[PDB]
Design a protein around this ligand. Structure first.
Ligand SMILES: Cc1n[nH]c2ccc(-c3cncc(OC[C@@H](N)Cc4ccccc4)c3)cc12
Lengths: 20, 336
C-alpha cells in the first residue's frame, strides 16, 4: 500500500527546509 | 473584503517603512523549555517574569545565520513579522539582539504542531482538513495582497492554539516581492514545479503548497514522496498525482486545480483569484466570514493544564544560551 511505503521511508519525521 | 484589504495595506506599509527595533531584553524572560528546533535556531517556552506572561521565543545564532547565508532572509522575517497582523499569523510581541543572538518573542500556541497530531492520528477527516485549509486560504489572501510570499507551508510550521485554530509560524523564507523571485526555497515535498525550473516564480507557489498540504492532511502522506530530494523533484515535474479512494470527488477536483503545473490554469493564480478557491464545491459548507471571526466550532480542541503547559510538544535536549563578551556580526544585522 502507499501508506506502508511512506511509513517505511526516511521522510516521515519533521522535514528540514532546504536553504542552499 | 476590498475595504478590509485597503485598510490592512495602509497599516502594513506604515510599519514596513518604519520597522520597530529592540523592544525587550533577554534577562526579563525565564527560559522554561525547548519547544522545537531547526536549521540554526531553536524555539523555547519563555515567561516574561514581571508579568507572568508566557511566550514562545525563537533564538538564532548570528554566526550560524551568516554561515548558512541566511542574513537577508532573516532580516526579511524580522521586518515582515513586525508589520503584519492577521488572526492566523503568530504575532511578534518583542524582538531584540545581543552580542551573539537574535531574538523573536511571539504569542505562544499551546496546542502543539499540526505535524505532531497528523502523524499520530494518521490522517484528518475532510471536514477537519477543510477547517484548517480555510484559515490558510484567508491567510494567503491577506499575505499576497501585501506582495508577500510565504514559501514554507507544511504541517511542521502550523501550530494549533487553545481554541484549536491555526497559527502560521516561521517566516524565515517569507519575502516582499513584486514580479518574480528565484531563491530555491522550501521543503522538497511542497516545492512547486517552477521553483526547481529556474525561470523564477511568484505567489502562485504558495497555492501549489496549499494543494500539497490539503492532500497530506486528508491522506496522511504527501502527493510526492521518496527517500531523497532528487527523487522527489522528479515526481513533482511528472505532473502526476494519485488520490486515495476515500478522497471525495470535490476534493480530487480541487486538488487537480491546485496541483496544476500549468501556471495559467492553477487556482489562486487566475482571473478571479482566491475566489476560484473559496467558491469551489469542496468549500461549499465553509462560512468564510465565520472562520475569519473565529466563531466556527473547531474539530479539535487540545485543551491543556493551565498556562505554561508544554504537554503537546516533544522533548529536546536543553542547551545553554551563550552570549560572548564580543559583539559579533554587528554590521550585518544592524537593522534587526
Ligand atoms: C510553539 C510556538 N508558539 N508560538 C510560536 C511562534 C513562532 C514559532 C516558530 C518560529 N520560527 C520557526 C518555527 O519552526 C517550526 C518548526 N519547524 C519547529 C518547531 C516545532 C515545535 C515548536 C517550535 C518550533 C516556529 C513557534 C511558536
Amino acid at each position: 500500500t502507499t501508506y506502508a511505503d511512506f511509513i517505511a521511508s526516511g521522510r516521515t519525521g519533521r522535514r528540514n527546509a532546504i536553504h542552499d | 473584503v476590498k475595504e478590509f484589504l485597503a485598510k490592512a495595506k495602509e497599516d502594513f506599509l506604515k510599519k514596513w517603512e518604519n520597522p520597530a527595533q529592540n523592544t525587550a531584553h533577554l534577562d526579563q524572560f525565564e527560559r522554561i523549555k525547548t519547544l522545537g528546533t531547526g536549521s540554526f535556531g531553536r524555539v523555547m517556552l519563555v515567561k516574561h517574569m514581571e508579568t507572568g506572561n508566557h511566550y514562545a521565543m525563537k533564538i538564532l545564532d548570528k554566526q550560524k545565520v551568516v554561515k548558512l547565508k541566511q542574513i537577508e532572509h532573516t532580516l526579511n522575517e524580522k521586518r515582515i513579522l513586525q508589520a503584519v497582523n492577521f488572526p492566523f499569523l503568530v504575532k511578534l510581541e518583542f524582538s531584540f539582539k545581543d552580542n551573539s543572538n537574535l531574538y523573536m518573542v511571539m504569542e505562544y500556541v499551546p496546542g502543539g504542531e499540526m505535524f505532531s497530531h497528523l502523524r499520530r492520528i494518521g490522517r484528518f477527516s475532510e471536514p477537519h482538513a477543510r477547517f484548517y485549509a480555510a484559515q490558510i486560504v484567508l491567510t494567503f489572501e491577506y499575505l499576497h495582497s501585501l506582495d508577500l510570499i510565504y514559501r514554507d507551508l507544511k504541517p511542521e510550521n502550523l501550530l494549533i492554539d487553545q481554541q484549536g485554530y491555526i497559527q502560521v509560524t516561521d517566516f524565515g523564507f517569507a519575502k516582499r516581492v513584486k514580479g518574480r523571485t528565484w531563491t530555491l526555497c522550501g521543503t522538497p515535498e511542497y516545492l512547486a514545479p517552477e521553483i526547481i525550473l529556474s525561470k523564477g516564480y511568484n505567489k502562485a507557489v504558495d497555492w501549489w503548497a496549499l494543494g500539497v498540504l490539503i492532500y497530506e492532511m486528508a491522506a496522511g502522506y504527501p502527493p510526492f514522496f521518496a527517500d531523497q530530494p532528487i527523487q522527489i523533484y522528479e515526481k513533482i515535474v511528472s505532473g502526476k498525482v494519485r488520490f486515495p479512494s476515500h478522497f471525495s470527488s470535490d476534493l480530487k477536483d480541487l486538488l487537480r486545480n491546485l496541483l496544476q503545473v500549468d501556471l495559467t490554469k492553477r487556482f489562486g493564480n487566475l482571473k478571479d483569484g482566491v475566489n476560484d478557491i473559496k467558491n469551489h464545491k469542496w468549500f461549499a459548507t465553509t462560512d468564510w466570514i465565520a472562520i475569519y471571526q473565529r466563531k466556527v466550532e473547531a474539530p479539535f480542541i487540545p485543551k491543556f493544564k493551565g498556562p505554561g503547559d508544554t504537554s503537546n510538544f516533544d522533548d529536546y535536549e536543553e542547551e545553554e544560551i551563550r552570549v560572548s563578551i564580543n559583539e559579533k556580526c554587528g554590521k550585518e544585522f544592524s537593522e534587526f
